[PDB]
Ligand binder design. Structure first.
Ligand SMILES: Nc1ncnc2c1ncn2[C@@H]1O[C@H](COP(=O)(O)OP(=O)(O)OP(=O)(O)O)[C@@H](O)[C@H]1O
Ligand SMILES: Nc1ncnc2c1ncn2[C@@H]1O[C@H](COP(=O)(O)OP(=O)(O)OP(=O)(O)O)[C@@H](O)[C@H]1O
Ligand SMILES: [Zn+2]
Ligand SMILES: [Zn+2]
Lengths: 605, 611
């Protein structure tokens, strides 16, 4: 099929000249666009007469209803939009599209050529006729007889511009999406354009394409491929040092990934604890709220408080309260609600069912209660904002305690792994007790559960070594002293063993220099880990005891580690996403969620 | 800095009027684009007089030497080429590029606009003149006095087409790269186009950009991010099944990766064996070349021959010959040549230095000689074709309990790991850990504790019947980071998931597996005994394709790759590329070697057919 589209100005003979472009083969369909000016009407009648005879191919004539003459740029946009829609409707297939720029204003020809290039056409040409017509033999043919004489005299010279590929994202635009109004009055189609949507869409597509092309070169220093579409100015802003104050709003909206969160350390004090206590099912076994004053300077302690004091800080919650089913469900729902506030797109809550199991509530019942509460809280949230939650069972050894709880927790995890396969699942076991525990963990690996190793109040480099190799771990928690063995900072980096760093937890437990101008020997080891290839993440540890969320941790990473580029923050998020204990469906959903990185709003300095 | 570029035609009053778009501001310099037609010479003289009587900003006139008048399309392409080059020479920066396209023909203005959009322009504007001039008071300005009175009377209604930001790969071009030759004739510069290299440059840039944008949506599915510049037809081609017959050349052209290539079976038979033998430093000490008839149909046996027989096929070479330094050097040089002839961008040759020791030659000396031979071979090759080769030491689990060689190999590996830090290096060990319920993978007994202690890697050789227990004992007790011939992995649905999650690569050898275990060939669908390549790939495992023993298997890396299309029905080309990328990513290289390998991998050879 061949459809020929041309615009006619003051001369109507252009269409007949182009009619014989390919010769006797002809064009199956011909469409002509013309202005509404009265001076064009005589040409319209002449062309109607010329079309009645030579009635071989189908014919139709289109006039721009709202355009008469070129007077300014507004009519410019008007006829540009009208021409775009007219060509879209009349030539749905680019391969069958032939266009001639002889007719219309010079700007009309330029705009039509631009439209062809942007949307594609089979061929573009301009028809020039010998001016051996009319009186004195010095004018172009302007009558039916003159046009016919020109056609049979081989006097038409065709300037074929060759194929025009079109544009990738704009080769599919169709008239139905951007319909054009046509009013029929005789044999002439009167065309009017409703809105400017198409031009705005084209401009946006072109701007996005140019941004993508500009950023295409460095497609490996961007953690997320979707960052390519970002404007070059935004990308340059991205690599600058992270400012803890001006970036609070942006870092608030990042879809984050929380991999180290304790369920028992969420509402240890404050209004959250009061809510948990009020939602209790049996408001008679609740222990008195013990007074546990916070250290001065909280949440930024003046000096470290050691691990033991840190744990003792949250003594109003946990096992000594969560044994009431109402309190447990209230705690779970409040934790999920707090997760939804920071736009956390994925989390792995760490819970210990045994600490909450009573005589009449076996640990399996408590774990099922928690899992189903979380599955509920997920199911009352739209998937476009849902925060998937997977559970980790903390199997912590007791200093002088009983291994019976460890057996309880390993068996519970092994059973929960197989029981559930959709929604909130049990992904792995956390070892908040690491020393070797080798044969105690052979069953866990045999069924394929992940294991994370929880380092706490420690300064040893053999614990980190035996975690990696004896009880094969896939994530190390709080391993702040790992460069002290240059042999292991090269196996953790080569085996992809993620290191979960908690800024506030590690600062409050131990304390590090803050907002230092230059890195020294006491600064936070985050950047040293990053530059060595380590998959270092950032988390919150205990949301309650630490008294701050993931956003605060990411923001204070700047003060703790000087000169950290927010691109490093995105790298940490991607590392967490790659380190999570997800499966194909959850992993794909998480990755689709991460691609929506919020745009900056103060990239002007 | 503000500049103006405009072509001129039969109406010479166009450039003067256009020069007042900024009005009283003026422009730093305006250049005139002109053709060789003689109908515009009076206009050129009028413009020269106007410039002389209106001094200040620099002025120039350029006439198209080869374009006298518009007759055919060739003049049009020449005009566009001249426009592009002249704009580059006079408008290297688009921030000061202002365009007025009043002059010329209809196609001249369209070419002006296309060039402006392609290379960007700060302002593109057109001039409309109110007809009030001439003797009849109806024509437009055509003389110097008419131009001046039109300017003063304000008969100009300029139109601004908007800014042209440009094109990312075409806004950085500089004039000197594509110089413009011009002949001076008084005040008018006579430009000339040396060639149309610029047009081809622009066309290539636009085509590559179109390919990038078309395949952009879905770059996460491309094994190599550099494939986004491939034509969409080629991207469709990649997603089709592989063909063993037509795809010989394309596979031969891939920059591949080798990870399972034993040095003791490279020249076990034939011309290579003779080349090795005649290189011995002690020709009279060479063991007699025995008779080792190959089974019929080799390298495609009509029935499986067994691991014992397969191993025995390599008697002519190995410990029999390689004790001689000359034979060792010949082996190394020929192996490197065989690698280069197959376009391998990274290899890990596993040797057994202790097996080649003598009374006067300690295992360390043999290892040093091998490493230095490979380093020399690497040094003489241009860096574009240099196949970075690392070494893996083999701790064979020979029956009987002999641990002298195993201990020696582990100690030698721990020593070489630090002795060398550039070029060819020792990167790990490849514990065989045989099957017979007495060695398995629990042979650890602290034997492999030191190798882990120093940061070395381990790669097991799951034998000819390990049965899921070996593949677990090795993964979870030896901390193996690769597994060889893990063909029964599908048995336990838990191992096929632990391997996928932990990212443990699986090394497969199509030809060796076919010749030893035997598999259905040329099948239409996938049955119980179908080769597990596609099964492993589906589950997410990181499967890699290698050669095992070059000499014994008598098939190079390309032969192994093409045999998958016969072993695994429906295997596609994109999956071959995915296997190459997995092999590259699962190798024991460091940052420098990995970066070189990744730079070498991006150069995928374009298909010869496309359909
Ligand atoms: N920040 C922390 N780092 C390491 N271990 C912690 C931390 N906070 C608590 N733990 C220990 O981890 C295990 C689980 O703690 P969780 O936060 O779930 O509270 P819990 O067990 O209910 O608290 P409690 O110590 O008051 O009985 C317990 O052994 C707890 O002592
Ligand atoms: N496909 C294979 N499967 C298992 N073991 C193998 C295989 N190929 C070689 N081996 C064993 O691994 C080692 C191979 O190393 P290499 O060939 O360099 O030494 P070699 O002593 O010269 O070998 P060979 O006995 O083959 O001549 C030898 O122990 C060989 O027995
Ligand atoms: Zn913790
Ligand atoms: Zn092997």
């Amino acid at each position: 099929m061949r459809i020929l589209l041309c615009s006619v100005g003051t001369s109507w003979a252009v269409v007949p000249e182009a009619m014989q472009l390919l010769g006797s083969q002809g064009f199956d369909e011909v469409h002509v666009l013309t202005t509404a000016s009265s001076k064009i009407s005589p040409g319209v009648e002449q062309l109607l007469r010329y079309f009645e005879m030579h009635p071989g191919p189908r014919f139709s004539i289109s006039r721009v209803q709202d355009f008469e003459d070129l007077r300014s740029e507004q009519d410019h946009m008007l006829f540009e939009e009208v021409l775009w829609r007219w060509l879209l409707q009349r030539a749905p297939q680019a391969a069958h599209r032939y266009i001639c720029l002889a007719g219309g204003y010079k700007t009309i020809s330029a705009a039509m050529q631009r439209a062809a290039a942007l949307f594609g056409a089979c061929e573009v040409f301009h028809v020039l006729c010998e001016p051996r017509f009319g009186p004195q033999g010095n004018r172009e043919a302007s009558t039916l007889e003159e046009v016919e004489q020109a056609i049979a005299t081989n006097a038409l010279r065709f300037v074929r511009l060759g194929p025009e590929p079109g544009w990738p994202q704009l080769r599919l635009l169709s008239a139905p999406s951007f319909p054009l109004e046509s009013t029929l009055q005789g044999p002439v189609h009167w065309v009017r354009a409703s809105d400017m949507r198409l031009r705005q869409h084209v401009e946006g597509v072109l701007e996005r394409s140019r941004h993508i092309l500009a950023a295409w070169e460095g497609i490996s220093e961007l953690p997320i491929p979707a960052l390519a579409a970002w404007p070059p100015s935004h990308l340059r802003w991205l690599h600058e040092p992270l400012d803890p104050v001006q970036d609070k709003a942006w870092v608030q909206a990042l879809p984050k990934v929380e991999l180290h969160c304790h369920l028992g350390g969420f509402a240890t004090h404050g209004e959250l604890l009061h809510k948990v206590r009020q939602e209790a099912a049996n408001p008679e076994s609740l222990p008195p709220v013990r007074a546990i004053p916070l250290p001065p300077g909280w949440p930024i302690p003046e000096e470290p408080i050691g691990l033991e004091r840190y744990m003792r800080l949250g003594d109003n919650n946990g096992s000594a309260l969560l044994k009431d089913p109402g309190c447990l469900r209230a705690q779970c729902r409040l934790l999920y609600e707090a997760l939804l506030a920071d736009h956390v797109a994925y989390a792995e809550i760490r819970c210990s069912p045994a600490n909450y199991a009573s005589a009449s509530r076996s640990p399996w019942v408590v774990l099922q209660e928690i899992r189903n509460h979380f599955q509920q809280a997920m199911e009352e949230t739209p998937e476009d904002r849902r925060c998937h939650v997977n559970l980790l069972l903390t199997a912590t050894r007791e200093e002088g305690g009983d291994r019976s709880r460890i057996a309880r927790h390993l068996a519970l995890a092994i059973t929960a792994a197989e029981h559930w396969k959709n929604g909130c699942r049990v992904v792995g076991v956390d070892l908040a007790g690491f020393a070797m525990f080798a044969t105690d963990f052979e069953p866990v690996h045999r069924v394929g559960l992940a294991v994370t190793v929880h380092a706490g109040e420690n300064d040893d480099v053999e614990g980190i070594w035996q975690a990696v190799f004896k009880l094969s771990a896939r994530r190390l928690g709080h391993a702040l002293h790992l460069s002290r063995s240059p042999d292991l900072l090269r196996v953790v980096a080569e085996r992809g063993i993620a290191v979960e760093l908690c800024p506030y937890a590690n600062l409050q437990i131990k304390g590090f220099p803050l907002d230092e101008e230059q890195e020294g020997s006491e600064t936070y080891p985050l950047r040293g880990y990053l530059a060595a290839g380590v998959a270092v993440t950032l988390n919150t540890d205990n949301l309650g005891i630490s008294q701050a969320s993931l956003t605060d941790n990411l923001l204070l990473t700047a003060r703790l580690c000087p000169g950290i580029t927010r691109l490093e923050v995105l790298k940490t998020q991607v590392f967490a996403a790659q380190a999570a204990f997800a499966n194909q469906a959850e992993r794909k959903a998480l990755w689709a969620r991460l691609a929506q990185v919020p745009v900056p709003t103060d990239t002007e300095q």
